[PDB]
Amino acid sequence: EDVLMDFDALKDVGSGLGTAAVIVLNKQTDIIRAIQRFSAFYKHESCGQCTPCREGTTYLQRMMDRFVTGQAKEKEIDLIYELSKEIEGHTICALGDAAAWPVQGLIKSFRPEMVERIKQYEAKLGESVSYGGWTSKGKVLDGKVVSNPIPHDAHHH
């Protein structure tokens, strides 16, 4: 409402004027999938030498894919926030900091949307999903996960 394009005025509200690629959206879209796509971008583009971003960027990716379908638990929403804090400040180059800020952006301002997504999936599936996505009956048979929604959201390809 009073956003003024500055290197620091946008910083006060938590964002920043990095590359001035100002993006404007509408309410007829799911930001959970839009942020999930950034997470799958920083993962695929991280060089992969520092431990926090070689692995932690995969930790985010493996969790936003369960978020976008709502196959998670409500407390796991703030679990991934604690993950993003374990990455920042520990990497050599600023790509690690750039992979955690979008995760906080979803949580900071759009928290109720993730809860509604999970509450949908409880109703949609019918059976609540435990930590990590495991249903009550999900197990391993002859070398494959069975009786559980496997999220083939790793670009398939």
Partner 1 sequence: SGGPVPVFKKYTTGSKGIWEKIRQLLTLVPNRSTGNPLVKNYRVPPPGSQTLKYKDPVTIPAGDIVKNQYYDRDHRRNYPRLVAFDQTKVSGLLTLGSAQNPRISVGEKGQKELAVFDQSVSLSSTLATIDPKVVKSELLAEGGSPVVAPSLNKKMKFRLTEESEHGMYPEDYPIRIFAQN
Partner 2 sequence: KEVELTVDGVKVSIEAGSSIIQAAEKAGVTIPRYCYHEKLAVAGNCRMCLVEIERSPKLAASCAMPVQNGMSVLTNTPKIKKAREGVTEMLLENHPLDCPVCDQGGECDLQEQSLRYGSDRGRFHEIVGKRAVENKAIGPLIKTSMNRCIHCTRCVRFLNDVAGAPEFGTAGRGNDMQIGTYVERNVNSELSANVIDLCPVGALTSKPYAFRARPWEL
Partner 3 sequence: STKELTTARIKDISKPDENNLQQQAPNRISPWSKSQKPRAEAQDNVRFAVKDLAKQPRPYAAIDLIYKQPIRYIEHDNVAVCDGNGGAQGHPKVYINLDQNKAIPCGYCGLRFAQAAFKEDIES
Catalog residues that contact partner 3 under the rule CB under 8 A.
139-145
The correct pick among 1, 2, 8, 82 for binding partner 1 (CB under 8 A) is 82
- Which of partner 1, partner 3, ligand SF4, none binds 82 (CB below 5-8 Å, type-dependent)? partner 1
Amino acid 44 reads H
Q: Contact letters (x/-) for partner 1, 122-151, by CB under 8 A?
A: ---------x--------------------
Interacting residues of 139 by C-beta distance below 8 A, sequence separation 6+: 145, 146, 147
**Residues making contact with partner 2 (CB under 8 A):** 43-52, 54-59, 62-63, 65-66, 79, 85-87, 89-92, 130-134, 138, 145, 148, 150-151, 154
